[PDB]
């Protein structure tokens, strides 16, 4: 198949494995008309003759969308695609009706998976969502070798060895080998996407708690690839892998992006034979301080074995963590494995997951050695090197069915509405520019006066054991058991002195405050929170809510150490401050001209503040009837400030599953759309021209035509004469009549 | 008609807050429905009004005041031109009606500079007030076509007749006239001219004053209601529900997500309920207006184009003809009738 | 043309409108019920949306409070639904009144209400059923071609006595010297008599 | 009834008379001619009964 690299999804000057709905044999015959079982097709024309193709069902269904293609040739190919319901070629309900102009000799085609229809236009791919497209399993072909047409009927699960050189495709060789590749192996696409149509055979969604079983939602998941390493050859001699796929052996399949990832994902191989599934071996992690060893055994007596089961078991396996500090062989049970082990995922953050489920959490991992003792290569299908992305996922029986990355404006609309494909028409949009803002602070006059507090903890371990508990923790408030604020302003820190040991074995312990029993979070007491009075204590105080102090050894065991107690009463004598402001006599902050978070005379919100000057006689706060600041006057002077919400909403016109244009309040280019018009009360942004036949979408006195340009609406033309009078005159009196039937519907 | 309103599912609940963008996912099937209802209604209304506002260039041209002569019509006729690329403008009466009782320019709501006006202040809450359908040029084209029909009598070509003749025909309809000389016409033209002046004066500031007052009261009422509905919707944003604040940001500045999400969910529930209520109100208003449009069309056909015999319908007297002009969200009909004196 | 237009002339305009309207009615009935049903998932300020799940976790002393919150919410949803239903009935009653008028005036009798049943000269109408309603097919006449007629306002015998047609709907005209009378509506000429 | 601006008093209305009391009850500096509901609750200490 003389495909382009773009169609294949391969890098230049290289050698890769391509899997999926590929073309193979070419039906170079003059049989005119034929029908095949198919999941798609490719064809090549150059000759000046019509050709046509259709994907359909084995019977006529009035409500099935059918796919019809026609090609006509002149200088270029005029290619028409219609996806519609038909009256037993009369269409009456269409998803798409498009014309493309293509290079002669190009291989063009269609492939279907589930309800996803992919249109291959040589240089580009366009995707549509078509209800029950998977039913369209019959292919009709109208095409002869006599007129240059050749085609390949697409079946399924093809694996091809591809070689590229100097922009050309050199080799296209179908494997007789590559058994099972089509379920596990693919090429990394540009920007790290997983190819549409891939079956996520052993790819789990990661969780921290509950799992999804069936439905559609936006997830944050490690599904963008920087590398992908097939049948990697990992052996006990391999050594440690440092997350970034820059190892000497990592011959990634497809595109490679030389950066640093969030996780490594191990897609494990196994069979039905338990004796080919249980392997001796360990997983070792290099943390910032110590090696950590993970391993399992069949009985609870972990000391008797050191294994990793892959695939299905027939008995429980107990898994433990070992780590040693100067012969202090700390060892703990962690948990029981699932009946079947399919995927292991390790984060740089230290989080370790099996089949999506989090088992333990190390402080940090520099590198991993998946130390399976073996005889073969056949323990792994692939190692993936990935980062987190915002994706829309169709989940079924916990598995990924449809993965949509939302990077482009249209994909983002699909995400925003949680819907795999939209309905042509108008949609509201406001793609909030989520980010970190600077904070402004405006308040009535007051002298600045601030005190520091730290809630500190110092700890010792190894009293009789580790994992069980801390030996002792010393808790204090600036060294006291009680500290109060007697100042206008204050701020509070939390400090865990692992450093007291001089040699932080204590880095294996995590000690921190839990959410308390208080109507505030401890860590947020440094925002501009206001009290009449507070007082803090390290000892029990009647009536005082508290924040428990908890300890863990790598998030396996949990125990309470102590608590911070706090009292308070509401009012406005004491204000929390984000940091220890100094020098300043009277504290305030004001940032202008891009988004901020603000607290202004107790109005709290976000937006953009700009200076102005109007004769605003009266008070200093101006609000909407919804209670939102419109502006404020700066007390000591007459300067006024205007407050606006930077994330403005707009209206988007959608047609043929794409963005056509948009109506906005802001004089700027937008969703790829460049051509900006000014209209009496808005701007319209398009990419269309000024010559576009007819509206396809309408409102008011204008319509949006097929290419997005605007067309004025004109009232229906109609007229007649008046009633003739009793006057000597030349009258016009109807002689010949016809008839028409007018249709009216009334609900009863 | 009435103005279409479209309200953003999210902006009116959590005004640009990325935390709600996640929390609201669980209400997609209940939140999207708000937009579906509002958008559909706007669509249906636009189509319906568009189907009325037709145009005839012959009658439009013949609507010239010189076709009417002794009877005047100058305060009724659209301004022929405003030296601009526009087919027509509002008549003197229309300028009066609109000015006395009184679409948002959204381009201003991004500049800062001034304390915001009310419109932008509503825009900032995701409440958009859309452009109208019955715009001034359409209404003038429609109206002018109706008026020219008064003089475009049933002749060859598009020849017109004197309005005096047109009226004579409309008299013969009622009772065949047996007098060659039209003694009646000068009396009626003069009387008509006074009536029209009285009406315009009555609107600016005879039992016509009763009838005009009623029209004004009704026009004002329609306007007030549209404003009131939006103010209510907007005001409800301040109705802190059972939560710490009414500002989502203020909640997230104080509480971690484990509690903040609950406080915010209470606010979300409340705000979604407010939107559901609003939508119901809107739909009911559309139903009322549809009733009124049906009637209006009947009057256009029977009392403008034809001339009925439906005593008690268009005008409490002997109906000769009616004039139609635009008014805020509607039509104003001026029914010219005869009243016996002696 | 109409049947074909419905299956898939300016009749296509009119048919399209009827179809759009019929579809709209159907969609609304479905949508209302879906909303009512969907609201059952809207867990109110309680542990769950399943009453059973609440009773499996909490004794009655607390469970009854959690459930009372769910009950309040669900009753409110029903009240809202009822209001919606009643409003729809009101709308339909309006439509039924109109439909009956059209049956009487435009089917049984034949009106002269220009602008009512059909934009033209109404001859007859056919009525069929449709989803939740009636479909009317109004058969009207439309002029195609008309004649130029040399009309006279009357005859004035001896310069003294005007005579005019009694009936205002008639035209007296000169058919190249032959005087004839016609309807102002349809060109069906005849000779005049004194009794005219 | 006080009109407050920048924390300062702008307009001070004592509500002793019936009309001033209506202004207080509706929080509004001047009314619109027409009809209003009123119920000027006679706030005081009551004796308590027990049955
Ligand atoms: C309760 O307290 C209130 C709270 O403080 C009080 O309302 C305030 O009342 C004062 C009256 O004392 C307001 O007066 C403003 O004065 C501007 C200042 O100029 C005058 O004063 C200077 C100082 O007194 C003089 O130097 C200057 O006179 C000189 O210049 C003239 C012009 O060159 C000349 O003719 C004179 O000889 C002389 O040489 C002058 O006299 C004034 O600009 C201001 O603007 C309003 O009027 C403009 C004209 O109508 C509008 O263009 C502006 O657009 C203003 O109207 C807005 O406010 C009204 C009041 O809120 C609304 O009705 C309008 O609808 C409009 O509101 C819109 O815009 C607001 C944004 O601007 C927005 O928030 C609204 O939602 C809406 O969008 C005005 O006269 C003062 O501002 C009032 N202050 C506030 C904050 O409202 C109320 O009176 C008290 N209650 C009672 C019972 O009394
Ligand atoms: C179970 O619950 C845990 C609960 O904590 C959760 O783990 C946390 O995951 C997030 C995601 O996995 C980790 O937080 C950070 O994520 C960014 C993600 O990239 C996005 O954002 C950046 C910034 O907005 C964009 O540029 C980018 O395009 C993305 O859109 C990482 O980049 C952060 O890595 C930092 O640390 C590395 C190691 O310290 C550095 O190499 C990297 O440079 C980062 O430095 C930045 O952050 C420091 C933070 O202290 C700061 O000091 C530096 O200046 C700098 O800004 C980063 O990891 C978060 O860390 C995770 N939790 C833990 C314990 O680490 C699990 O995902 C959740 N699991 C599941 C399945 O739900
Ligand atoms: C009831 O509703 C109908 C709709 O159901 C209205 O009937 C139509 O009335 C208009 C005037 O009211 C008719 O007038 C004819 O319009 C044709 C349209 O021209 C435009 O479109 C062509 C095609 O798209 C363009 O090339 C052209 O530039 C225009 O933009 C003209 O083409 C007709 O003129 C021709 O025929 C006459 C008659 O044979 C010749 O004298 C002229 O030279 C010319 O060749 C003409 O104007 C339209 O036909 C009517 N519709 C129907 C269905 O017949 C009815 O008026 C309405 N109301 C009532 C009471 O009847
Ligand atoms: C996942 O693990 C399975 C192992 O559990 C692995 O499948 C095995 O692959 C090899 C490698 O892909 C197979 O091929 C064998 O090669 C040796 C080569 O000299 C032959 O001797 C073998 O002959 C036996 O099997 C034939 C086929 O059944 C018989 O005809 C012959 O008598 C012999 O018994 C054989 O071809 C091996 O079959 C399969 N193993 C299984 C269980 O099928 C799989 O590839 C893994 N894949 C990856 C990527 O990890
Ligand atoms: C994780 O840390 C744990 C914490 O201590 C480790 O547990 C220890 O594991 C070793 C092996 O796992 C035990 O070995 C002991 O060996 C003595 C000596 O006899 C054995 O050797 C002679 C010579 O090879 C042979 O003849 C005998 O048959 C024995 O095989 C035994 O007598 C003990 O019975 C025992 O097996 C340690 O005692 C043991 N710890 C505990 C608490 O038992 C665990 O290894 C670490 N896990 C990993 C994977 O490294
Ligand atoms: C809160 O805890 C810290 C630790 O318990 C105590 O304040 C710390 O004071 C030092 C000295 O004033 C600060 O500066 C440090 O100086 C050394 C030597 O020049 C330098 O290496 C360090 O980089 C640093 O500058 C230290 O910043 C400050 N620590 C913090 C977190 O602010 C502070 O005293 C506590 N609060 C109270 C009430 O005691
Ligand atoms: C929306 O943004 C465009 C941004 O390009 C604004 O239009 C631009 O307006 C300037 C100012 O009127 C144009 O005139 C230029 O002025 C400089 C200074 O006098 C002179 O050196 C240049 O030769 C030129 O005249 C500029 O042509 C024009 N931009 C374009 C593309 O024509 C536009 O007005 C903004 N529109 C609104 C409504 O805010
Ligand atoms: C908690 O404080 C005690 C009290 O300050 C610390 O133990 C003291 O250690 C010094 C140095 O070894 C001895 O001279 C004192 O006699 C010890 N005090 C007591 C009461 O035994 C303890 O080590 C601190 N613990 C932690 C975890 O920091
Ligand atoms: C592991 O050994 C280091 C030495 O190998 C221990 O840290 C030292 O402990 C001695 C006395 O016990 C102190 O003098 C040193 O100054 C310590 N080191 C530092 C940097 O302060 C370490 O505690 C042992 N760690 C264990 C058992 O956890
Ligand atoms: C109604 O008839 C006019 C009369 O011929 C049409 O002719 C022109 O159409 C263009 C484009 O449609 C307009 O810019 C011109 O203003 C129209 N001409 C004139 C003289 O007004 C017009 O298309 C017809 N149809 C409609 C719906 O208006
Ligand atoms: C009845 O007499 C009046 C007088 O003969 C005729 O109306 C005149 O029509 C011409 C038409 O160009 C106008 O210039 C005159 O000003 C009209 N004159 C007057 C005095 O009204 C009328 O046509 C006669 N015929 C009919 C049918 O009424
Ligand atoms: C009535 O017709 C006159 C007919 O002449 C209109 O006035 C003319 O408007 C054009 C507009 O482009 C000017 O060139 C002519 O010079 C004007 N006429 C005169 C006499 O000055 C007049 O506007 C029309 N009146 C109405 C109500 O439509
Ligand atoms: C093919 O796609 C690239 C983007 O991947 C674009 O730059 C190029 O112009 C396209 N070429 C053609 C012939 O469409
Ligand atoms: C598609 O499969 C059938 C079996 O399903 C096979 O006969 C056919 O030749 C295959 N297609 C191609 C292009 O070879
Ligand atoms: C693909 O080609 C390279 C070059 O022929 C060879 O190294 C590789 O093993 C081939 N892979 C397959 C699946 O045949
Ligand atoms: C309380 O803290 C101060 C902190 O500098 C310290 O001097 C004091 O001795 C502590 N109080 C007690 C009772 O020890
Ligand atoms: C935007 O904010 C950054 C801080 O967030 C500041 O450097 C920059 O000047 C800002 N202003 C504008 C208008 O870009
Ligand atoms: C003041 O108002 C004018 C009013 O015309 C505006 O141009 C100017 O930018 C304003 N802003 C400031 C801070 O001066």
CB atoms within 10 A of CB A695: 17
All partners of chain C with 3 or more CB pairs under 8 angstroms: A, B
Q: What is the whole-number distance in angstroms between the Cα of residue A510 and the centre of ligand 6?
A: 22
- Closest ligand by atom to A106 CA: 13
Best to test chain B binding among C37, C113, C160, C167 (most B CBs inside 10 Å):
C113
* CB-CB under 8 Å, A747 with C11: no
CA-to-CA distance for B280 and C79, rounded, in angstroms? 13
* CB-CB under 8 Å, B112 with A642: yes
CB A95 within 8 A of CB A84: yes
B266 lines ligand 12 (CB under 6 A): no
Per CB-CB distance under 8 Å, the chain A contacts of D2 are none
DSSP code per residue over B45-102: HHHHHHHH--B-HHHHHHT-GGGTGGG--TTTSPPS--SSS-S----HHHHHHHHHH-
CA-to-CA distance for B2 and A741, rounded, in angstroms? 32
Shortest distance between the Cα of C144 and any Cα of chain A, in A, equals: 5
Pick the atom of ligand 11 nearest to A727's CA: 27
Pick the atom of ligand 8 nearest to A497's CA: 28
B65 lines ligand 12 (CB under 6 A): yes
Resolution in A: 3.4
Q: What is the whole-number distance in angstroms between the Cα of residue A621 and the centre of ligand 17?
A: 25
CA nearest neighbour of B320 among B191, B210, B178: B191
User: Closest residue (by CA) to atom 3 of ligand 9?
Assistant: A503
- Taking the Cβ of residue B337 and every Cβ of chain C, the question of whether any pair is shorter than 8 Å is answered with no
Task: Name the β-bridge partners of C173.
Answer: C151, C180
- Taking the Cβ of residue C81 and every Cβ of chain A, the question of whether any pair is shorter than 8 Å is answered with no
CA-to-CA distance for C80 and C87, rounded, in angstroms? 11
Task: Name the β-bridge partners of A622.
Answer: A631
CA nearest neighbour of B13 among B247, B188, B232, B205: B247
Q: B156-180 as b/e, with b when 16 or more CB fall inside 10 Å?
A: eebebbbbbbbbbbbbebeeeeeee
Chains A and D touch (3+ CB pairs under 8 A): yes
Question: Which C-chain residues 97-116 have CB contacts (< 8 A) with chain A?
Answer: 98-99, 102
A419 lines ligand 18 (CB under 6 A): no
H/E element, A124? strand A124-129
CA-to-CA distance for C100 and C106, rounded, in angstroms? 10
* CB-CB under 8 Å, B29 with C87: no
* CB-CB under 8 Å, A747 with C18: no
Q: Which residues touch B88 (CB under 8 Å, ≥6 apart)?
A: B60, B78, B79, B80, B81, B136, B137, B140, B141, B144
CA nearest neighbour of C2 among C156, B252, C10: C10
Per CB-CB distance under 8 Å, the chain D contacts of A620 are 6
A vs C, Cβ pairs < 8 A, gives 135
CB A43 within 8 A of CB A149: yes
Tokens representing A746 are 């009334």
CA-to-CA distance for A521 and A513, rounded, in angstroms? 10
Pick the atom of ligand 1 nearest to A622's CA: 74
CB A446 within 8 A of CB A584: no
The answer for A502, left when phi > 0, alpha when psi is -120 to 50, beta otherwise, is left
Q: Which residue bears the tokens 């366009």?
A: A126
Fill in the DSSP letter of residue A302: G
Q: A31-47 as b/e, with b when 16 or more CB fall inside 10 Å?
A: eeeeeeebbbbbbbbee
User: Closest residue (by CA) to atom 7 of ligand 7?
Assistant: A667
Gyration radius of chain C's alpha carbons: 33
Per CB-CB distance under 8 Å, the chain C contacts of B156 are 148
CA-to-CA distance for A493 and A739, rounded, in angstroms? 89
Gyration radius of chain D's alpha carbons: 16
Report the pocket of ligand 17 as residue ranges, CB < 6 Å: A 438, 593-594
Shortest distance between the Cα of C91 and any Cα of chain B, in A, equals: 7
Q: Is B16 exposed, middle or buried (0-12, 13-18, 19+ CB in 10 A)?
A: buried
All partners of chain A with 3 or more CB pairs under 8 angstroms: B, C, D
- Closest ligand by atom to A453 CA: 6
- Closest ligand by atom to B89 CA: 12
Alpha helix stretches (DSSP H) within A609-725: none
- Taking the Cβ of residue B239 and every Cβ of chain C, the question of whether any pair is shorter than 8 Å is answered with no
CB A496 within 8 A of CB A459: yes
A701 lines ligand 10 (CB under 6 A): no
Helices B183-204, B92-101: inter-axial angle, 10-degree rounding: 30
Per CB-CB distance under 8 Å, the chain D contacts of A445 are none
DSSP code per residue over A627-651: S-EEEEE-TTSS-EEEEE-SS--EE
- Breaks in chain B after (C-N > 2.5 angstroms): 102, 205
CA distances from C44 to A654, C36, C72 (A): 36, 15, 9
Pocket test for ligand 18, best of A593, A609, A613, A615 (most atoms within 8 A of CB): A613
Report the pocket of ligand 16 as residue ranges, CB < 6 Å: A 478-480
Helices B208-235, B257-300: inter-axial angle, 10-degree rounding: 160
CA-to-CA distance for A278 and A310, rounded, in angstroms? 6
Q: Which of C38, C115, C184 sits opposite B301 (nearest CB)?
A: C115
All partners of chain B with 3 or more CB pairs under 8 angstroms: A, C
User: Closest residue (by CA) to atom 93 of ligand 1?
Assistant: D29
- Taking the Cβ of residue C189 and every Cβ of chain A, the question of whether any pair is shorter than 8 Å is answered with no
């Amino acid at each position: 198949a003389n495909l382009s690299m773009l169609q294949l999804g391969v890098p230049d000057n290289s050698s890769t494995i391509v899997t999926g709905l590929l073309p193979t044999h070419w039906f170079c015959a003059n049989q005119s008309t034929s029908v095949y079982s198919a999941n798609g097709f490719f064809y090549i024309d150059v000759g000046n003759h019509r050709s046509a193709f259709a994907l359909h069902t084995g019977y006529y269904d009035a409500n099935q969308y059918y796919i019809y293609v026609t090609n006509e040739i002149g200088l270029n190919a005029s290619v028409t695609l219609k996806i519609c319901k038909f009256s037993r070629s009369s269409s009456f309900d269409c998803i798409v009706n498009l014309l493309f102009t293509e290079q002669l000799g190009a291989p063009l085609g269609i492939t279907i998976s589930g309800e996803t229809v992919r249109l291959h236009l040589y240089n580009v791919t366009r995707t549509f969502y078509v209800p029950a497209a998977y039913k369209l399993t019959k292919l009709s072909v109208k095409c002869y070798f006599n007129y240059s047409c050749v085609f390949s009927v697409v079946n399924a699960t093809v694996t091809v060895n591809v070689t590229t050189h100097n922009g050309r495709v050199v080799n296209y060789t179908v494997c007789d080998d590559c058994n099972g590749y089509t379920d596990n192996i693919f090429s990394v696409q540009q920007d790290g996407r997983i190819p549409n149509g891939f079956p996520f055979n052993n790819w789990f969604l990661l969780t921290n708690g509950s799992t999804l079983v069936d439905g559609v939602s936006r997830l944050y998941q490690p599904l963008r690839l920087t590398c992908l390493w097939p049948v990697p050859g990992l052996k006990s001699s391999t050594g440690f892998v440092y997350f970034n796929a820059t190892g000497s052996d990592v011959n990634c399949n497809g595109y490679q992006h030389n950066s640093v990832v969030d996780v490594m994902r191990y897609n494990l191989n196994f069979s039905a034979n338990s004796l080919d599934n249980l392997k001796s071996g360990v997983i070792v992690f290099k943390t910032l301080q110590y090696d950590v060893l993970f391993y399992c055994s069949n009985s609870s007596s972990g000391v008797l074995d050191t294994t990793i089961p892959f695939g299905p078991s027939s008995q429980p396996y107990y898994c433990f963590i070992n780590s040693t500090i100067n012969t202090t062989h700390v060892s703990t049970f962690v948990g029981i494995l699932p009946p079947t082990v399919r995927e292991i995922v390790v984060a740089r953050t230290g989080q370790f997951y099996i089949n999506g489920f989090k088992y333990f959490d190390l402080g940090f991992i520099e590198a991993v050695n998946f130390n399976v003792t073996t005889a073969s290569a056949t323990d792994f299908w692939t190692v993936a090197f990935a980062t987190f992305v915002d994706v829309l996922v169709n989940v079924s029986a916990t598995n990924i069915q449809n993965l949509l990355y939302c990077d482009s404006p249209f994909e983002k609309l699909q995400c925003e509405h949680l819907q795999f494909g939209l309905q042509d028409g108008f949609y509201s949009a406001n793609f909030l520019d989520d980010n970190v803002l600077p904070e402004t602070y405006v308040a009535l006059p007051i002298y600045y006066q601030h005190t520091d507090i730290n809630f500190t903890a110092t700890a010792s371990f190894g009293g009789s054991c580790y994992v069980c508990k801390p030996h002792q923790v010393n808790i204090s408030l600036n060294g006291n058991t009680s500290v109060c604020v007697r100042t206008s302003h204050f701020s509070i820190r939390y400090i865990y002195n692992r450093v007291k040991s001089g040699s932080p074995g204590d880095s294996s312990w995590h000690i921190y405050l839990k959410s308390g029993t208080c109507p505030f979070s401890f860590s947020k007491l440094n925002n501009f929170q206001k009290f009449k009075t507070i007082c803090f204590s390290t000892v029990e105080v009647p009536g005082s809510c508290n924040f428990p102090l908890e300890a863990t050894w790598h998030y396996t065991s949990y125990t309470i150490v102590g608590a911070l107690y706090v009292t308070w009463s509401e009012g406005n004598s004491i204000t929390g401050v984000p940091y220890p402001v100094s020098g300043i006599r009277e504290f305030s902050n004001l940032v202008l001209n891009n988004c901020t978070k603000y607290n202004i005379y107790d109005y709290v919100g976000t937006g953009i503040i700009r200076s102005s000057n109007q004769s605003l006689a009266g008070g200093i706060t101006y609000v909407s009837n919804s209670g939102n600041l419109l502006g404020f006057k700066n007390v000591s002077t007459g300067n006024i400030f205007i407050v606006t919400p930077c994330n403005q909403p707009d209206q988007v016109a959608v047609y043929q599953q794409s963005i056509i244009g948009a109506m906005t309040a802001v004089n700027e280019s937008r969703y790829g759309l460049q051509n900006l018009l000014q209209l009496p009360n808005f701007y319209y942004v398009s990419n269309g021209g000024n010559n576009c036949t007819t509206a396809v979408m309408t409102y008011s006195n204008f319509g949006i035509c097929a290419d997005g340009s605007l067309i004025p609406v004109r009232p229906r033309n109609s007229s007649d004469n008046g009633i003739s009078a009793i006057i000597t005159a030349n009258l016009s009196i109807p002689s010949n009549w016809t008839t028409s039937v007018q249709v009216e519907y009334l609900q009863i | 008609t009435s103005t279409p309103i479209v309200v953003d599912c999210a902006t009116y609940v959590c005004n640009g807050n990325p935390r709600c963008k996640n929390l609201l996912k669980q209400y997609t099937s209940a939140c999207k429905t708000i937009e579906d209802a509002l958008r559909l209604s706007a669509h249906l209304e636009t189509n319906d009004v568009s189907s009325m506002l037709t145009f005839d260039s012959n009658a439009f041209s013949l609507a010239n005041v010189t076709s009417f002569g002794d009877y005047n019509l100058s305060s009724v006729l659209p301004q022929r031109n405003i030296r601009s690329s526009r087919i027509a403008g509002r008549s003197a009466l229309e300028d009066l009606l609109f000015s006395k009782v009184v679409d948002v320019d959204y381009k201003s709501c991004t500049k800062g500079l001034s304390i915001a006006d009310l419109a932008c202040a509503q825009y900032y809450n995701g409440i958009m007030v859309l452009p109208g359908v019955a715009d001034a040029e359409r209404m003038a084209m429609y109206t002018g076509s109706l008026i020219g029909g008064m003089v475009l009598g049933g002749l060859t070509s598009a020849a017109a007749i004197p309005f005096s003749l047109a009226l004579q025909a409309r008299l013969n309809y009622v009772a065949l006239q047996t007098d060659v000389l039209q003694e009646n016409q000068k009396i009626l033209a003069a009387s008509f001219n006074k009536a029209i002046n009285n009406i315009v004066a009555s609107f600016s500031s005879a039992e016509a004053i009763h009838t005009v007052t009623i029209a004004l009261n009704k026009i004002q009422d329609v306007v007030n209601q549209q404003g009131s509905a939006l103010n209510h919707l907007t005001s409800q944003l301040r109705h802190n529900f059972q939560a710490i604040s009414n500002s989502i940001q203020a909640i997230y500045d104080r509480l971690d997500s484990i509690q903040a999400d609950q406080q915010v969910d209470r606010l979300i529930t409340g705000r979604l309920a407010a939107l559901n209520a609003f939508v119901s109100q809107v739909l009911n208003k559309y139903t009322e207006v549809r009733g009124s449009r049906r009637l209006a069309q009947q009057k256009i056909n029977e009392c403008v184009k034809s001339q009925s015999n439906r005593y008690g319908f268009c005008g409490n007297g002997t109906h000769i003809f009616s004039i139609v002009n635009s008014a805020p969200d509607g039509l104003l009909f001026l029914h010219t009738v005869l009243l016996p004196t002696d | 043309n109409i049947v074909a237009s419905f299956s898939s002339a300016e009749a296509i305009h009119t048919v399209t409108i009827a179809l759009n309207k019929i579809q709209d009615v159907v969609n609304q009935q479905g949508s209302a019920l879906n909303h009512l049903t969907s609201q059952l998932r809207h867990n109110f300020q309680a542990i769950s949306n399943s009453i059973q799940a609440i009773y499996d976790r909490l004794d009655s002393i607390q469970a009854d409070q959690q459930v009372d919150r769910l009950i309040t919410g669900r009753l409110a949803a029903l009240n809202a639904f009822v209001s919606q239903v009643l409003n729809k009935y009101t709308e339909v009653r309006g439509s039924r009144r109109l439909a009956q008028q059209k049956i009487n005036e435009c089917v049984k009798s034949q009106s002269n209400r220009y602008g009512f049943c059909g934009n033209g000269t109404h001859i007859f109408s056919i009525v069929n059923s449709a989803p939740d309603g009636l479909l009317f097919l109004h058969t009207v006449l439309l002029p195609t071609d008309y004649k130029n007629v040399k009309a006279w306002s009357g005859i004035c015998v001896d310069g003294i006595y005007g005579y005019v047609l009694r009936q205002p709907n008639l035209v007296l005209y000169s058919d190249n010297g032959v005087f004839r009378v016609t309807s102002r509506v349809m060109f069906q000429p005849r000779l005049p008599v004194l009794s005219d």
